[PDB]
Symmetry: C2
């Protein structure tokens, strides 16, 4: 990667070059790749979502639809604005279920202002249906594509379907090497309003004049440099991720279920995932609405053992996301369940997916996993 | 400058984020440090861990940068701005008056140490203690500044440091939250990473943010801390050179006795005398206010710009900003006076005595 090279350039030419050179190049690279006409490099994907919600007009007490089977970072922005989240279970793609979504919009006494749709693990959600549903209901679509950069739906890049899209670049570890998020959107004015907010809402004056208040969300040039370096190898990395996914499927497909991506869609498989002792006939066990209360979810015996054994072999595997509708933080919020995300947590396993891995690495891991489940 | 060296190490493989926090603790003597994305984020978390809730009152410096007070808005708390004294910081009497007149007890005070200058800490610390007001020091521009040999930022329950100026887009980024209570600081740390419970899976009792600094920027922060003292000393030299060459027509207000301003940015006042201080005492319901720069200041800025030399007006007080329309502010007329007669001068540490002299020459020619 050109990370070091680019960072050296930042330091060396800082004294003479145009402002935010690499931030500008980072945004352009994302536009070229996604085909979005607007891009804003920010501190994180959470910050991108926060600005999207705000420029979309979300206010305290407004209703915002969201995926239950996701990472809290995708929905916390709803709390920042003191809006109310309504969670929806997922389907066979790991994303928001069409049926449950329609049911929720219908039974909502107050019409939701927007929907934050997560493309979990890089998988595309059923976009044609969801896009239409949001259009027919005057709901702003905000795509949480934090882990879906490189994923496509019918030759269209995830993130370009809604009014706003958000990409992330450095995984979910508590501390990472780099950081940053990119907010993209259809409306130039709205994206530029967000740009305005990302730098403390300064009016164009000789001194500091403020008609509104903003934030400190603008990405730095050093991280923008890393972003350009990462975008340069994105495609190659996505192909490698899918190679890794296909190898796992090849070595474990007998005992684990690897749910297919939508036809005419290309999941970036940013993280390989699989389900043990699973059958599609287990999906949609129920269809009920609830008021959230905390609940633990018991891991399938083979999964907890799998995680433990591979751990003693120095291989890191993890359970899938724990649905928001089971989290204490969202106690009292409305949620629609079909039982799918809890089943996925129960039988799911998240596998090592670093692109530096060779087929042998993926093979040794697969052998250890097979040895553990039998 | 170890930036590249450290960054290179980062790539060859949060080591540096931890080191960055340690370096701040070693420098400031604080027992707790938390590396974040920005100073604004640091202030945000300080206010939250402090217990500030919607509609609570938070006292704050009027003569400051909005980044310092936006956090109050984030929590939907109500700001009460206070004018400054001769240090550029919150005036002691206006602070007491504001406290005496508050409908209810303010939860906290965000005290800015403007341009690195120390505020009257013995008095303010006492005032906050006696009134049970959480003191949060906005030392964004004051890292390296001291009050009676004690580092600014370590007097309040919470302190905040920034590292890369306010250019709309900077090379690096970062902020540091320090504090006296380990538990409060660790709660902030908990919040800075999406409020994750320490479990294999993701469990949440509360919601948090993505405010944690990256390892790359942490490495840069370490490099910056290692040369901070050398920088401060140079900033102070530069300040003295300006006073030496411009002292005749510009006033360079002294730092508090026994204190040490890091003079991160050299500022001066034209045609000014201590006698015009505290000229307009009153409190208002904030309304946007346009303040015309002193003729010579606006001209000075224009002339230097023609010479490719950047200078800027001083901060425009919050009590004159439209965004805070309606909010209360206790004034004495100082921050507005400083705005009309003030100038922020080039303060790069790479500047030699000759460079400052030449810049001073152009200035003297501008004001003739």
């Amino acid at each position: 990667g050109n990370e070091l090279k680019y960072i050296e350039e930042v330091f060396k030419s800082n004294y003479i070059a145009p402002l935010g050179e690499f931030v500008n190049r980072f945004e352009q690279s994302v536009k070229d790749y996604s085909k979005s006409e607007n891009a804003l490099a920010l501190n994180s994907a959470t910050a991108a979502l926060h600005l999207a919600l705000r420029v979309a007009g979300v206010k305290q007490d407004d209703i915002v639809l969201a995926s239950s089977f996701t990472f809290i970072a995708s929905v916390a922005p709803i709390c920042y604005l003191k809006a109310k989240p309504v969670f929806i279970d997922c389907d066979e793609t790991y994303n928001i279920d069409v049926d449950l979504l329609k049911l929720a919009i219908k039974e909502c006494e107050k019409k939701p202002k927007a929907l934050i749709l997560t493309h979990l693990y890089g998988n595309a959600a059923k976009m044609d249906e969801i896009v239409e549903i949001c259009k027919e209901n005057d709901i702003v679509l905000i795509e949480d594509a934090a882990e879906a950069l490189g994923s496509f739906y019918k030759n269209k890049a995830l993130g370009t379907f809604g009014e706003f899209g958000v990409y992330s670049y450095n995984g979910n570890k508590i501390i990472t090497t780099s950081g940053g998020g990119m907010l993209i959107g259809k409306n130039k004015e709205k994206i530029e309003k967000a740009r305005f907010y990302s730098t403390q809402a300064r009016e164009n004056c000789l001194h500091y004049e403020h008609l509104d208040y903003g934030y400190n969300y603008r990405l730095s040039n050093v991280l923008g440099a890393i972003g350009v370096a990462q975008m340069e190898v994105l495609e190659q990395r996505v192909l490698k991720k899918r190679e890794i996914y296909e190898w796992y499927k090849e070595f474990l497909g007998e005992y684990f279920s690897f749910l297919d991506e939508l036809e005419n869609s290309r999941s970036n498989r940013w993280l390989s995932t699989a389900l043990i002792n699973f059958d599609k006939n287990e999906l949609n066990a129920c269809q009920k609405d609830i008021n959230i209360s905390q609940k633990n979810i018991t891991l399938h015996p083979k999964i907890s053992k799998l995680i433990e054994d591979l751990k003693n072999k120095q291989i890191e595997t993890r359970p899938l996301w724990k649905a928001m509708h089971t989290q204490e933080v969202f106690k009292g919020a409305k949620a629609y369940l079909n039982g799918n995300s809890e089943l996925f947590f129960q039988k799911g396993i998240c596998l090592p997916s670093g692109t530096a891995m060779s087929k042998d690495d993926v093979y040794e891991i697969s052998k250890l996993i097979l040895k553990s489940i039998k």
